Design goal:
mainly alpha; 29% helix; Guanine nucleotide-binding protein G(q) subunit alpha
């Protein structure tokens, strides 16, 4: 009964650090069931926007379980894991009729009394420290 002609926006959450629990490569199964949605006949629209949360589960799930444990494609020199998840999810639609907007909802994204600005301030502190060298 969920009938509506124009859509132009639907929002499903694609989890970012849930790529290890299958008995076969459940993240590849999710990315393969990504194909029957955004290239469907009456789901054909302007664009679709996908939210990838749990970004702070990256450093706590990339060390003991590296990204190549189930995906034999990642060959980068870590944010490269989530960038590779984004690339493997955006290289699915074989048409530029649907531009894909990708948003990485972090966990520090519900309170902004300079809080994300404080993380930026610590990052400028580290990136200003690393400019120095043993002269």
């Amino acid at each position: 009964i969920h009938c509506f002609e124009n859509v132009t926006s639907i929002m499903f959450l694609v989890a970012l650090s849930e790529y290890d629990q299958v008995l076969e490569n459940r993240m590849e199964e999710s990315k393969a069931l990504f194909r029957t949605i955004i290239t469907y006949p009456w789901f054909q629209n302007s664009s679709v926007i996908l939210f990838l949360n749990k970004k702070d589960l990256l450093e706590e799930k990339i060390m003991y379980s590296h990204l190549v444990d189930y995906f034999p494609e990642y060959d980068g020199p870590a944010q490269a894991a989530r960038e590779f998840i984004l690339k493997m999810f955006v290289d699915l639609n074989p048409d530029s009729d649907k531009i894909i907007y990708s948003h990485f909802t972090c966990a520090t994204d519900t309170e902004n009394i300079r809080f994300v600005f404080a993380a930026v301030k610590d990052t400028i502190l580290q990136l200003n420290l690393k400019e120095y060298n043993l002269v």
